[PDB]
Design a protein around this motif. Sequence first.
Motif, short mmCIF file in Angstrom:
data_model
loop_
_atom_site.label_atom_id
_atom_site.label_comp_id
_atom_site.label_asym_id
_atom_site.label_seq_id
_atom_site.Cartn_x
_atom_site.Cartn_y
_atom_site.Cartn_z
N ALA A 1 -72.69 -2.85 119.31
CA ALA A 1 -71.57 -3.51 119.94
C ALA A 1 -71.86 -4.98 120.20
CB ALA A 1 -71.23 -2.82 121.24
N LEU A 2 -72.33 -5.69 119.20
CA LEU A 2 -72.54 -7.11 119.41
C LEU A 2 -71.75 -7.99 118.47
CD1 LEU A 2 -76.28 -7.14 119.92
CD2 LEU A 2 -74.49 -6.91 121.63
N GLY A 3 -70.76 -8.68 119.01
CA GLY A 3 -70.09 -9.67 118.21
C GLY A 3 -68.70 -9.23 117.83
N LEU A 4 -68.25 -9.70 116.67
CA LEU A 4 -66.89 -9.48 116.21
C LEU A 4 -66.67 -8.14 115.49
CD1 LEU A 4 -64.15 -10.59 115.90
CD2 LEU A 4 -64.95 -12.00 114.08
N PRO A 5 -65.92 -7.25 116.13
CA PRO A 5 -65.62 -5.98 115.47
C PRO A 5 -64.79 -6.16 114.22
CG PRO A 5 -65.24 -5.84 117.82
CD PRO A 5 -65.43 -7.27 117.51
#
Lengths: 548, 48
Positions: free
Chosen positions: B40-44
């Motif tokens: 869950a890090l950054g742009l999905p």
Amino acid sequence: GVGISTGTFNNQTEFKFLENGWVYITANSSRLVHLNMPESENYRRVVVNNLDKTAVNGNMALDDTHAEIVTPWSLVDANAWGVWFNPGDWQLIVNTMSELHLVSFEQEIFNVVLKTVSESATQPPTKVYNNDLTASLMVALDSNNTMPFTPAAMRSETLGFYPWKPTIPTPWRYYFQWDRTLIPSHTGTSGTPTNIYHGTDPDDVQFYTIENSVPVHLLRTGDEFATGTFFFDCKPCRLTHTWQTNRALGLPPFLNSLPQSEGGTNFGYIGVQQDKRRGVTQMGNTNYITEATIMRPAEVGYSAPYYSFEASTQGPFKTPIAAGRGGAQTDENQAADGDPRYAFGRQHGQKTTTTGETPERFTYIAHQDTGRYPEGDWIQNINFNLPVTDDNVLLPTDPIGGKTGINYTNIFNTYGPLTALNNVPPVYPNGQIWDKEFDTDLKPRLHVNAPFVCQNNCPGQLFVKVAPNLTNQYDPDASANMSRIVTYSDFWWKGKLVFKAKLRASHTWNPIQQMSINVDNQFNYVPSNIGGMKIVYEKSQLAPRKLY
Amino acid sequence: TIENSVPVHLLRTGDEFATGTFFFDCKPCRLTHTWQTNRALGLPPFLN
Ligand SMILES: [Mg+2]
């Protein structure tokens, strides 16, 4: 007001040379931007779940399962080298300068236009577009970094790399918490290995909105919005690669026998028995002193697990690798060195004439020889009784845990307090430039997606959104659809990224690696018979350095 | 031995012993937990 422009197009790159070889690279960038109204004016919590693919067994790595909060906002991210330099600029930088500091960054939005389609007029029946002068473009700048950092560079979703070709933002969106278990398996495994989405840990719920966190500016045609000038503070990124691995650190052994004719096998010889030699080793047993045995002051690079996947609450993920390059002549373990692979489309480098939805790709192989070639690793027994017996050595050939395709190197890790590293080299043109630092009490010694990391505070993200253009039909109390005038906007974006670099110098008799063209190569830097065009992957740390 | 290393004070009923004020300096301890793992890090990825 209406018929009066509010800004200036400038995609010019100025190199201002000062004293003592400091240069002041001011990269200006401008784009025409296109943006349509949101699909709905709402925030949405959407979950993605591909049991379709994961239930396959042996398919764990194909997990895409996650949760997400959908925003009516779009993100203007210019965090990628291609936005700021053409190849020519990049040539100059990379060939002539030794390092690079990130100094300042500012941006503005001007000459806003809002037009309504609408529509039907008349017979075939055709479409018609009018100006809505009184319409507004919503702009919001998160200068407090209140909101989750979502750099678009990872998804090749930044602005266009071409100045004369218009572009778009990307619908903004961010990760929402979810619990998730997925147990690994293989093709042979039968039964169904547990593969579940548990839900949402309430203790971890963060639902963000632009509206409640950031002041929103309304821009009509005659308005403009500029951010301040943000000043960075980070380490320098260096534009030279190091070539020495442990095997070339310090004083080479004196040769008592020098060759006496030129040629390809006229070797020179140390000329002393490997056990009667002088020097220092960290092998308490033998008196053998060889180049693979002799002490080195520390260790360049480190060995990592590959393809290692680890798991926590939200599922499995690859274990990232720092170093690279590690292989010799044209052969590297592109997974063991964690060599990165970039996939992108037309807007960001692929030939703009190419039809089809398949992206262009490449794998960046750095020049800095600091990686590993795990095929060449091994482990001997304490006794060092050599030539070594099969029972006293562990090879990358010998299977582990009774699996044919696995050896020790796959789980091996030689990171330690003697490990030495370089930071990731910049990947032109698709690489990220800067990245926010993790808000963990202890921080990573680097990031793999960008060479500049803001421990300070990073520039805020810029969000746009077309204002709700309502019809005379509007009942909010009703569940029925929001009926809105079909509206969209065109606006211009200008940015200024300022670097400070330092000129390199000749220290060797020989010349060195530098870009150029090339009877090959030559056609990636010009358009085509039609409207071109292509931007090509192109390295960065071309000049050699010196470890020791 | 305490005795060879530290000055010793003898306290009778009417006596008291007070220390100075010791001033610390260490990094801050945070009262917030982080929930994001690598996944869950950054742009999905964009949903079509
Ligand atoms: Mg090399």
